[PDB]
Design a binder for this molecule. Structure first.
Ligand SMILES: [Mn+2]
Ligand SMILES: [Mn+2]
Ligand SMILES: [Mn+2]
Ligand SMILES: [Mn+2]
Ligand SMILES: [Mn+2]
Ligand SMILES: [Mn+2]
Ligand SMILES: [Mn+2]
Ligand SMILES: [Mn+2]
Lengths: 386, 386, 386, 386
């Protein structure tokens, strides 16, 4: 019955089920949750673990005595439940000091502070066993053209990531970084707005092997992009270090719906790709239970994330294993797409009259791709109408 | 009076002013143009040169005798006018054989043909003096999830670009490649949909130094992205090999309006950045005169592209040179954004109590960025209201 | 097995399966179809009937002898198959004369011609038994601000529709009009861009009872709008005279995918609403088989439209009939939403201290809406995971 | 120098300059403002007046003694400055009780309360001299399909507006209502999402003459719609009771930038239309100074709204008065667009062989519209490049 177990590796941010429902036009609709109670509540649902921002575990401005007791209580809930902490991250967006950014703030002292805050939490992340450290530069960007020279800001962004990579190397940590793109909100435009921009930026770091992406379903969809396509490119690059799952109904504010909501067909093709590719990291949900809900609806929504992943996994596997689909894939030439165009090499291609001079372009053009039958088989599988 | 001269390097595709106005719901509204007459007509307007697809110079399926006479006539118009041909490209989208792509077609024979067609035109491009060879993979992509394994397709795309780079190296040509991203249309989703995705892909080629981007204003805006930001990232990467200028009114079909139309403020900030950065390549217009127009309106629209570039150039230069704006930039800390965050190095940063333990975050947060005054100075400059 | 029969009332435009695959960057990939063969082919698939533009039945500029033989051949295919023609429409977009519009062309003679062309086809539509006459003003609009005074254009649009309503009244026809909104493409902005704008405009006609809407799934989604919501408003207004079904993957060019493709969840909620409301008109598909397909894929895609409608109909009915869902609807107060707010009347409301002075807003606010559990039941039903 | 005076009728919501900068990912960056100080500060800038939500003048849950003193202090600032209060509105979105809506909440008691809260503030609005009472139903809508039957919700919405119209009639007030559309945010989809949907809904009210629209620039642009077009339709309907001015950079979260920011060309065409139409209501700014700013930047941003309106007013007037533009308008047939298509009547049109049988469609089609020259004259005027 699509019941999750910890071996499914489902994880959740403390800030997700813990979202109090404050939006830019409304006050909180739910009380804050003790992280201890979310660990317990999630473990009961079948989750594998939790993630946190530094401020989602230890309230900003804590004395070290308080910090110690916050951590201690959290550590006991993990031990009580068997939950893990595979990823953590820094809040560089909530406090007003970060109103123009953390790593790319125009104010140099803020940039320095953002790094000092980030490094403190990396140490804590390692202590709690995280393998991935995410950065979402939600305040990096601008509302107006003169406010941000983006060439200078990317210099400042490279600087920061290079320093964090020097730091983890100096400490001998095994943790790796994952940049989480978003195209806008809360800034008018955010730097590194998509998976492609983040991938490209990483290739300009001193130690590129230490940084990957953490793409979020709804964020690429906020640019009207195909999320499964961007995940394929991240996988092709060897850079899918982590993944954020949720739903989004098109180009609008970041909704962070429960996974499977939003674009259901894209959710199907995403799961198909993650499972085909053997992605083995956490299946992490970054989602807000809608503020219409009380705490029972919070946990229902969380359960739904996991349930929908496992239904889509079953339907995609059944699609890929159906001999009628395999035949259709053959009919649509997907096997040909995986064979080299010219393993025979450039000269042989140049000398191959069958590639140009005697190529029958009209017979090739007349050959239908048969993609609509293939896609209606995929639809039939998704809906259990086979 | 904002009169262009060839030294402004303005160029135009033959397919732009030559667009007959056929759209997906309407027939042609203008006759086809002889490329000779467009070269002459553009030179009279002050353009520096023209670009072409192979099929926009030599009709598909020409005998070599016909090909020779087409080229000869074009060459004479160039010589008659002093016009140049700085860029050329391949039509891998119009013919039905390319209905599932050229380089990433599922059919291997089509992929081979696409390369054979591309290489033939590279030789011609070199003969006519082009320094940049553009690729727009407008048919590379899918309408449905099962039709295109994107991992395999990027393998096929890398293959193709690697082969074209082996070819130009083997011939000793100096020409370089520029990939032109577009997120969708005519395919439901197009591969390498944005500047970031193209930049990232190039870093996976055998000879990355040979490939840059040719970003188009309207295409990044079709993903709701900030075009000046993406140009800054391309410039930061050292990869702005060429630029396509036009206008776009938001997220919708590719309009290819005359430059300055669409998002006027973004046009201002683009020109500001190109001129600040000392971009020295062609200012190339990829635009469709609307099909409401007759041939006089075609040439009016072309003239307008150039005029609007030169007005925005003047207003941006005046903005950057105004001592009141310089002071505002200082007030908004843009100078600080250009200074290293931590040239003193990681350890010094770690030991700097002013970066954390004794950082006054409340006083930093209280400091306004003054970006609205800066932006109203930019507005006043753009509108000539100073 | 979700097999359609004519009693399902599925209809298709001749221009849908007959689309030759010409897009704004590519030539045709399929030959044209004889309307006779599409009637036969669709009847074999289980369709109820077909619709046409005047130019999709009789080629533009036909002699009346030719027109007669075209009609005669079509009439025989209808009789041979039992197919019906419930709707027809005018092509006021393909010919270059309509480059600035038909009814709102700036040129008065074109406006007159557009009406003369429209009235000729209304007579033919009546002869073939249509009950609905659609208008899609795809060329009505502008690319630039000065080109179209929209106040004057709406005067010209009202004029035209008023004249067509006088005409059908004068002839004693029973046919009714349906305006099909689209927000853009082929014009930069199209007038009456959404269901709401069309509904509002109709209330300004001389005979409002004669005009409704024909909303198309993909067009409202091209404005990022909720198609089921707009259909509910059209139904609430008593104005859903006809409906166009297809799919659309977000805000981009009009894709006209096969129904069920695009936004699958929205397709579910649409079918739920049409069936709940007892909509009894044609279930009309306005769709393009992708130009990757040959004619077998054309018919596969058409079959898929019908299949997906019938699967979604079954799943929605099962949702609405499930006692667990009924209970959830009760828990989410949907029954309360259908009860008058204040049947007791204004004064009683004013005097009801329970409505303000003694209203417990905190207890009301604390009551969760339970919408996430309700929606996961809807998801479970859609996917057959109950 | 584009200095505003109260006769320009510029108004501002207390919540605009008073926005503390709390966004869905960040805390406040500015303290709250005393409404008294905003009235004074705005009057010094040249504003005509202010508007308020009930909760933006009197903190929620005030004793009547407190309410009295809040009002008294506000009244004295108005008298001290000569500022007016032309519009007011109800906060039916911030308090958690309104998490599923006010007038269309599923909970009947909340719907009753929303009306009781609305009516209390209408009385206060009248006392302070407002002529327009706005409703923005920002919580009316849904995130999921089953949560909201939209047919029932529109019944509940009609009910509420009908009751408020009975109330103001019963009291003999002269105030009129204006519905402010928004397509989404904070709900996933908001009911009456555009100007067209609101216009259409009003025609279903018992007393339609009492309700108009208050369209907001950024909200229609959040649906990718042309704001000047929707204003023209509202003006054509006689329903532009009020207007909200700001800027928006495309399809994304509601930015509420200072007017003239966002889409500058659309701002030009809007002002052109308001001034051409002789719109005489308040020019009301609904805008957020970005949270990067301190209070000096708040007032700079407010000043900028007014400045940009007055620059665009000058440039549009100069466009409309330029004899070269008048000639171009004549060349593009805008005069013809304003002449009836068929004042000669239906029969005369039917009998006019020049309208069909002898219409030269090819010569008509060959006539260019000359819209690009017209639009480059508009551009030259906007930029002061004539
Ligand atoms: Mn998100
Ligand atoms: Mn995330
Ligand atoms: Mn383009
Ligand atoms: Mn281009
Ligand atoms: Mn369509
Ligand atoms: Mn349609
Ligand atoms: Mn707004
Ligand atoms: Mn507003």
């Amino acid at each position: 019955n699509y019941q999750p177990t910890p071996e499914d590796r489902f994880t959740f941010g403390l800030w997700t089920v813990g979202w109090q429902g404050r939006d830019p036009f409304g006050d909180a609709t739910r009380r804050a949750l003790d992280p201890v109670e979310s660990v317990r509540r999630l473990a009961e649902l079948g989750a594998h673990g939790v993630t946190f921002h530094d401020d989602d575990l230890i309230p900003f401005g804590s004395s070290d005595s308080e910090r110690e007791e916050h951590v201690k209580r959290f550590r006991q809930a993990l031990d009580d439940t068997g939950m893990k902490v595979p990823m953590a991250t820094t809040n560089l967006f909530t406090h007003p000091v970060f109103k123009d950014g953390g790593f790319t703030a125009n104010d140099r002292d803020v940039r320095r502070y953002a790094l000092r805050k980030t490094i403190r939490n990396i140490d804590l992340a390692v202590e709690l066993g995280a393998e991935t450290y995410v950065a979402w530069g939600g305040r990096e960007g601008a509302e107006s053209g003169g406010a941000k020279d983006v060439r200078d800001a990317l210099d400042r962004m490279k600087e920061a990531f290079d320093l964090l990579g020097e730091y983890v190397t100096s400490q001998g940590y095994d943790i790796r970084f994952a940049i989480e793109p978003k195209p806008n909100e809360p800034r008018g435009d955010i730097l590194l707005p998509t998976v492609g921009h983040a991938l490209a930026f990483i290739e300009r770091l001193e130690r590129p092997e230490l940084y990957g992406v953490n793409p979020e379903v709804g964020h690429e969809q906020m640019a009207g992009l195909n999320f499964p396509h961007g995940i394929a490119q991240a996988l092709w690059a060897g850079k899918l270090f982590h993944i954020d799952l949720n739903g989004q109904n098109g180009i609008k504010y970041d909704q962070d719906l429960r996974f499977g909501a939003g674009d259901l067909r894209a959710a199907f093709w995403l799961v198909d790709l993650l499972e085909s590719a053997g992605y083995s990291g956490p299946r992490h949900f970054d989602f807000k239970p809608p503020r219409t809900e009380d705490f029972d609806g919070v946990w229902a929504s969380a359960a739904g994330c996991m349930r929908n992943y496992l239904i889509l996994k079953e339907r995609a596997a059944a699609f890929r294993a159906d001999p009628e689909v395999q035949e259709a894939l053959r009919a649509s030439r997907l096997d040909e797409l995986a064979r080299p165009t010219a393993a025979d090499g450039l000269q042989a291609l140049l000398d191959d009259r069958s590639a140009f001079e005697e190529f029958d372009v009209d017979a090739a053009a007349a050959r239908g791709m048969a993609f609509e039958r293939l896609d209606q088989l995929a639809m039939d599988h998704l809906l259990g109408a086979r």
